């Protein structure tokens, strides 16, 4: 884990999700609030602007409810959005294309950003230029035909 201030809070939160991904995936499927309401996400929540925390949580929880109902368990997207579900949700009709953390820096809802960057070839997640670990259901990590020899 990292120790440099707000940045480290971000990196460390996504490292925790990756390291605990089996238990997180099952809880997200079966009983998501034991996950959304975990104290693990309190530091991440303090980085989200106070005036919009609840509106972001309403958006992500609603998105997850719809995802789950029609598709079940997109690993990268569940990991990305999860910490934003931690605040008490405020429901609204607002549709967010990005979500800000104070470190504003933007996490894009679809695809990669300077803050959150998943690499399909190495199968590792990078947060603010630091490694968060390897992402995974049926050998993990780097693809074939990367190392020439």
Numbering used by the authors: 537 to 609, 611 to 640, 644 to 676, 679 to 680, 683 to 693
The article reads:
The PB2 residue at position 627, which in nearly all human and avian influenza strains is either a lysine or glutamate respectively, is the best characterised polymerase determinant of host range and virulence. Here we extend the structure-based exploration of host determinant residues through the identification by random construct screening of a new PB2 domain (residues 538–693) that contains position 627 and is thus denoted the 627-domain.
To assess the structural impact of the typically avian glutamate at this position, the K627E mutation was engineered into the 538–693 construct, the corresponding protein crystallized and its structure also determined. Thus the mutation induces neither local nor global changes in the domain structure. However, the charge reversal causes a major perturbation of the electrostatic surface of the domain. This basic region is severely disrupted by the charge reversal upon mutation to glutamic acid. The temperature effects on viral replication observed previously cannot therefore be explained in simple terms of structural differences between the Glu and Lys variants, at least at the domain level.
